Design a protein around this nucleic acid. Sequence first.
RNA 1: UGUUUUUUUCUGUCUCGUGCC
Lengths: 732, 171, 126
Amino acid sequence: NEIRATDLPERFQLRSIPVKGAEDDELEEEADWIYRNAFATPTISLSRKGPSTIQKIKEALGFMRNQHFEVPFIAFYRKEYVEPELHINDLWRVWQWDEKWTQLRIRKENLTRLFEKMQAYQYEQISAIRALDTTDMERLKDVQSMDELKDVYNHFLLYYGRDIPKKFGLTPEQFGENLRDSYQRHETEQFPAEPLELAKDTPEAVLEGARYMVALQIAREPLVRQVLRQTFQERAKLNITPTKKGRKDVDEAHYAYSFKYLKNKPVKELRDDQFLKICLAEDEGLLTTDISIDLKGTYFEEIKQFYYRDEFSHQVQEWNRQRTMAIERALQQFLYVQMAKELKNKLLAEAKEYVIKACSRKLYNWLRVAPYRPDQQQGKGIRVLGIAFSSARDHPVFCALVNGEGEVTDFLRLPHFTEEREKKAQDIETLKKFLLNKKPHVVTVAGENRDAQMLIEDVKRIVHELDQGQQLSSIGVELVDNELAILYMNSKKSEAEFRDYPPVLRQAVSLARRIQDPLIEFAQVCSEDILCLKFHPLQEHVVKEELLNALYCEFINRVNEVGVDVNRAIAHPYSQALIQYVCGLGPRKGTHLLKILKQNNTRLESRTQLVTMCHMGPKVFMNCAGFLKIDTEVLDGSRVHPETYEWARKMAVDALEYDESAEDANPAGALEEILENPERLKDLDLDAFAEELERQGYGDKHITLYDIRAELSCRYKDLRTAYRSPNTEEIF
Amino acid sequence: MFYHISLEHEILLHPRYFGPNLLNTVKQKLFTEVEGTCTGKYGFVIAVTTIDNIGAGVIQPGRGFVLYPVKYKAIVFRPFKGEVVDAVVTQVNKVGLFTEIGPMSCFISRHSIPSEMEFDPNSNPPCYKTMDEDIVIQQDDEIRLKIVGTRVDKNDIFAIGSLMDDYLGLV
Amino acid sequence: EEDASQLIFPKEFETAETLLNSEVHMLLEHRKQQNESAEDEQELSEVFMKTLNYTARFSRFKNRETIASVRSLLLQKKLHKFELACLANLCPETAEESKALIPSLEGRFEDEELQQILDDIQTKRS
RNA sequence: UGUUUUUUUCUGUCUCGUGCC
């Protein structure tokens, strides 16, 4: 009930999980956090500039928090408030930045509360090396510094004690400042005393008593972490070199085994190149990995001079020796190890980001719906003749002739093949009989090896020479790679459509569907189904959650750009269940709407079907106004929502120069005439439309004017690509 | 808990192993037979330190195999109920905590944990903190526990921990 | 019935020899040092590696003489063998914590008598 | 620019008589 009958859409609620909406004051903080954490290591969103990008992100976050906007809903419906088509990852990136800012703010508030409580406890205890509750404010203010803030908080907890009932060397702050500035402003304990005298005032009789305390203070100091942070993570020439056993076990398969003596790989090769990071992670798993910056030998020398006394005559020499010992102890405790851990974390993050980017690129390349319809647009669509043969060696090859309306019309088998060692006529006769049995619109043959390609070519030649494409014309059998149809044949949809059929028929049906409506097949699959297709080997090393989220966002954006047919998902099972990746219409909401439509028998009468029938809430309708499309009002099956219906009608009337009288349906010259083709484009001016929107409407229509004109001129525009014929390398 | 006791065992030696390296072969076979295994009587065995003596090989009638009842001085790890040890947390999940008592892995549920240690699913690393956020428990931390139960899954010990007694956390 | 809290164990286990974390750590380290040499030998298993990295994170003292001294100063008392491992391994701070963790110490000895032993154990730590 | 096959220890009852070393 909360997912389907909720005030806000499902996408908006899912995006802002940690942060339930954005407040007026919190919007600026979220935008600043997103801008700061938008592209630190690599260049991303530098398109939108720094200040402009930050302003756009803040506007998108505010819109999402107020109107329950989503990724596509804010990228398209809020083109002005956000980057106007700056990049595809606009809404998703803004949502991620807002969530990160909210999480950082919550963590900072918790840290500040903990610091205040600790300070109050210390004041109550000691007020009746001190313990002052001054770092709580710094920790609470340090929202951007997540890892550094956590390290500082942990160091403070371990230094003050952490107990909850109910003069040795330089000071930590001075040492941290001298190390950060590069110049040792404060030296060690410039006193005549030496470690001999300091080791008697604890009860150990050892000169290393104060060294442990100094090391603990240095390790648990936020200033030290900040100074060390970014020094090696920014640049680290990781030298890849196989070990004695890694040289033979890797066999040049991983990053630490391909180059026997190829070292000095900077951070750009691991972060920017996700393949190198994945290889290093895989090699460092079992056998070994070669990950060493080799730049400290000189970064750790400069710190040695700082914090140590300069004179050497007993007191000065003793103080300098003690400072050097304390610095060495601190470095061994949390100096090299902390830097190595930070570098490893940065490398892992870079590898994960590269894997996610590769997966997103693969999803964008393979998800674009580019079917091969009749004439590359008698009857709606074309009859795709899905030919998914098994071997083509005297075995029954599936050959189904499905229609262009997301359904299979018929099919047949072809056991005869060029089986028989010398039989060049049986296959031709079988192909001719199959072609004469039905009247397909196109041929969709598969391929596995040289024999499969030869069989497909022979079938195409026989069809073209005897006009077997339609019985009265030659039909070109379009080549289709056996990539999507094989997976779709043995899916839930394939099993439900046909249960008592061989796998060849299912493969042929899947191939025919993949070359008729890729969007329908993508929306009618579990997303499990998407995870089956591997986007790249480096994605396995990185977390699959990021890849899945990127794929879901890409699918949602594609669905929003191409739209969804309301009547298509009412009676046709092939084009059903396509309301799961809509902007603002989540999976639960889509399922509830489909169930309501199946029960009440309500059709896609107009854009307000879910607002008038009481099926969808006002926020859901507003967020999903630009994605729901119907067969028939005039502006229902398009991106024009109810708010912009009057503006679209007025613009169409002005462009067509027709009469103005409550035009919603009755005047058709401005609606039908403009929908048929461009009637008058100079009549509708951008400045006039923007002024009208600002004076009446409460919003500028400078960016939305083009979208409204396109929706009024072309309804149900598809955002998928065109039919991509197989190439030489692609075919192979 | 690790202990050092004297155990006994016999291994059949195929006649092909006869020769100047008979004792060496018997020792080698003993090493790769009673290391890492587990039994319900003495518990989980870690490794063997030294061997006391080699018994007299009684050749079986009608069979070339000869058995050597060797008595080896090896160590053993047989945790009991009520003992308190110091382990390290391996993973933190809402269902429960996972640790690693050397060759054995225990598990503590949220019910055993007091109500003060809440969940932190929002943060990337699964961790449990209090309202004031003073004490923090995460993975790779030397956290103590109490063995309130034992189990042997066919030579695979898997005990169960608890976190009700006071003074169980960071030392 | 087998509960170490109430000092009860089977007959075979009653005659066992207790081991400390440092003792087992050094024994396994020496075994590894002996096994790594003498090539053409079956290498260690995952069990040995996990036990090593588990006992190495609780080595209160590396010196063997420390182990000898801490066992010698403890065996002089009247406590059972079981009380020689847990108390020497956990190294509690105050007598109250030791008495709470191990219920056997409740009423078995005085407070200062156990506090002095705990302080000595803490000092013996490296 | 091609070449059609793989399945395997079964199992029988209780009684009486005759001949031989």
